[PDB]
Amino acid sequence: LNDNSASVTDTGASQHLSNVKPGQNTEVKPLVKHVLSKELQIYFNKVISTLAAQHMKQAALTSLRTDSGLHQLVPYFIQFIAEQITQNLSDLQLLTTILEMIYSLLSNTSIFLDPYIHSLMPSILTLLLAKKLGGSPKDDSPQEIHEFLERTNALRDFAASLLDYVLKKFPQAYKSLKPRVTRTLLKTFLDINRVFGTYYGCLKGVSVLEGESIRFFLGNLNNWARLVFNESGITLDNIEEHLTKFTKEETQILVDTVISALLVLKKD
Amino acid sequence: DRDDLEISVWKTVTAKVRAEICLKRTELQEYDISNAIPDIVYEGVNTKTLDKMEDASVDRMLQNGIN
Amino acid sequence: SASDLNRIVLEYLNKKGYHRTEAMLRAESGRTLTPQNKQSPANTKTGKFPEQSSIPPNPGKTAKPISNPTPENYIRAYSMLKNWVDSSLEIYKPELSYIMYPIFIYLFLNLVAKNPVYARRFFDRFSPDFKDFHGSEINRLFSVNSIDHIKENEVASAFQSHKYRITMSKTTLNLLLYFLNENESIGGSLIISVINQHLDPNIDLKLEIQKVKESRDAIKLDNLQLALPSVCMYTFQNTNKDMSCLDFSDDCRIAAAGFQDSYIKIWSLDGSSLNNPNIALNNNDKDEDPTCKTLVGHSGTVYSTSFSPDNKYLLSGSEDKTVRLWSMDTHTALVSYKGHNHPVWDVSFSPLGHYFATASHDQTARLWSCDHIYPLRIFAGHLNDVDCVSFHPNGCYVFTGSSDKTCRMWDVSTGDSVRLFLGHTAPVISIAVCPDGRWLSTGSEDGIINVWDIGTGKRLKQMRGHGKNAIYSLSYSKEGNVLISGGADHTVRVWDLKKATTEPSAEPDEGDVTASINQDIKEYGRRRTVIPTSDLVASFYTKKTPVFKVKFSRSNLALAGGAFRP
Q: Which residue intervals correspond to the WD repeats (chain C)?
């Protein structure tokens, strides 16, 4: 079931040159709703509705992880993962459950997931580098600031350790998602006008890389610190109450996490 | 957050197709799920070795006429 | 002339000593199909490993296929959980680093009471990892080797009274329960019994495991649907029609191709070094390594080649009357195997890698062993020569197809044929038996595949989509029945085994345009065209290269392989 003064110098020079460079397509058919049997979509709605009741959630997670025969529903899962990520980007328990079912499908060794590597990496790279994740910080309280910060940092620390799981599950796609992901992180990291949590996700994604690539961020870290922390001629003495974008706690988190990954380059 | 060129032009030139895609899912591009080919860890040489043999033969002409 | 054959059968049974009721019941047993075994590939909940008891196989102590229905030591049952928690530097790592100690301690203290030498294996196998975490307690547990040694160590005797407390979260407890429920008979139930009887989890436990099993039963896939595989094709270029049948290893890192000029060519399919350098690295970068090694031990043309499931040895059968063994990590020959006087056409290892079967021109198949120079069984009874050979997936029967339009199933111990399958019209060239084991499939040189069931021995159905030509290889889906046939008409075809049988295999509920018009063109003529069965679903053509090999990997990705012909 497949899908059943000249203007030709643009449909031939940049429509079949900037399309033949990323592969080629002949219209694989996702949706007519005749391609799934009755029991298959019964199982599909029974697993998508449950994602006393944590037992059913873990049963659905393990049924995604271990059972075989869901090679037809695997494009319908990455659709209803992406819409519950880019449409419901405020609830951290649902984003945690969606990352759990991402990890559960990513451990199923009885389904082929190498086609879908490019439509599953932006979910991991957007729950790691979001401008906002919770969105409702419940402000006018430093305790609530710290609680919302830990609640939104748990998702960064989980999605960063799901990016390292997919850089090892698919080693045949090396030199096709290692430079792409480190280029995404180098592009998102090298600016001033971003929120703290995006920088934290960037540095944790740097941490879940390895080797000379971390050394590749050694040179452009000094000017990054001099722009994001404002050491305009400082003599490192009044550092506790000097700085301008951040607060003291998240600057301490940044100086902690920037050497939490720098220890890998001096242990060898 | 407007000083990035390649992300701003990607927001502008794709702003019509992504609205239709996200309205279709609740029922160049990198998130059309069905039409994607994976990548191989190693594919063999089929054209580069021809020109490699040709400029290697030119290199054997370049070594001052020794066969 | 079949009613006369029925009468000859009835008179044969009457003269060979079968009672009238007994002959009627053996006829009724012969007619009905082999029923469904629900543990068909032995699913890892209710399925067990084969015994490693150093005896050869024996198909006795076994009831009939017609009738309806169908110890596990502590070191592997702990190493399962050890590797499962060791494969994760995730957010749930240090909680498993916490809970890994008392399960090991209680398994050791429950195993010293039964087997002391297995306990001495089990203690020193997993000793030096948490010595810095748990102090000199494991040094105190050096002197426990018997039941009376437990009374010497006061903390070991207290471990029966003092139930070890552990405060565990709900997600970690549910993760452990749903991991140790998904595979009981490996040792998950043995871990669960120790957890239930010796531990103190802070948050009844039997009701919790009952809820785990019931919610795990509430959502499964009962009847599977088909899936179309992704085929990765390996095309070999500069072989001037002098490359015979090739094979891929498992992990798909090595390819082996037998040439007409007595080489075996070994390709690293990843572009790797394939030099096995072994960090010393003495000398010889002066040689030319094109990531490819050649093996020169034969004096005839290599007609078959087979990889071990261990993947460290290669078995090459030639037209000089030997089968040779090669080490895939030093690239030399090890053993020559001389038991044939005609050319060797199909070598094939066992499932468990124990002993290999061989096909040759002398109309006999031969069973071997990798430690014996000369054969062990002779499989004789075919009229023409044997072309293909294959084992049952338990390694207990042998299947041989031959050029007299038939194939046979042989007992591996008594040697004599158990089944003879008739119905083909051409030399059987490739044979394969499903991972269920109840159905046999083979392809001839007439382009017709067909499936029988091994209980009845008669034909369920056939497959009529290939060209009137050879079907070079055959492969099966790992879980379920989807047949992948790579033949000589440059196509790789996909076949549903469960259409015309009593198992329909979950058809879709609700049409096409290309269906039933492609072979309704028939420009070449009705009698000069092929008409496919209702079982054929897809067919991937390769554009002027033929496919010698299909090898279905574990994850719905098949690999095809062949040589670019002109």
A: 238-277, 297-336, 339-378, 381-420, 423-462, 466-505
Q: How far apart are CA C339 and CA C322, in angstroms?
A: 7
Q: Are A145 and B57 in contact (CB under 8 A)?
A: no
**Token reading at A39:** 């029991």
- Enumerate the residues of chain A whose CB falls inside 8 A of the CB of residue B22: 83, 86-87
Q: From the list C230, C237, C269, which residue is nearest B42 (CB)?
A: C269
The Cα–Cα gap between C521 and C514 comes to 11
Kindly provide the resolution of this structure in angstroms, with one decimal.
3.3
**C chain contacts of residue A33, beta-carbon cutoff 8 Å:** 510
* Residue at C24: amino acid letter: M
Report the residue of C231, C251, C268, C269 to disrupt the B interface, i.e. the one with the largest count of B CBs within 10 Å.
C269
Provide the token pair at C163. 């139930």
| Interchain proximity C271–B40, CB inside 8 Å | no
- Chain C positions touching B48 (Cβ under 8 A) are none
Mutate to test the interface with C, among B40, B41, B47 (most CBs of C within 10 A): B41
The closest alpha carbon to C432, from C450, C412, C418, belongs to: C450
**CA of A108: how far to CAs of A69, A74, A111, A215, A219, in Å?**
11, 11, 6, 34, 40
Residues C72, C18: Cα–Cα separation, whole Å:
43
List chain A domain ranges: 31-268
Element (H, E) at C460: strand C459-463
What is the C-alpha to C-alpha distance for residues C72 and C54, in angstroms, rounded to an integer? 16
Instruction: Establish how many alpha carbons lie within 13 A of residue A196's alpha carbon, considering only the half-sphere containing its beta carbon.
Output: 18
> Which amino acid would we find at residue C345?
W
Residue B54: both structure tokens together: 């040709």
Q: Do A28 and B26 touch (CB under 8 A)?
A: no
Nearest to C271 among B38, B42, B46 (CB): B42
Q: How far is CA C341 from CA C109, C178, C247, in A?
A: 59, 57, 25
Q: How many residues does chain B have?
A: 67
CB C336 within 8 A of CB C321: no
Strands, E, within A104-263: which ranges? none
Phi-psi region of C543 (alpha: psi -120 to 50; beta: other; left: phi over 0): left
Cα C531-C534-C537 angle, rounded to 5 deg: 95
Asked if C90 lies within 8 A of A165 by C-beta distance, the reply is yes
Q: Which residues of C touch B41 (CB under 8 A)?
A: 270-271
Please state how this structure was obtained. cryo-EM
CB C116 within 8 A of CB C146: yes
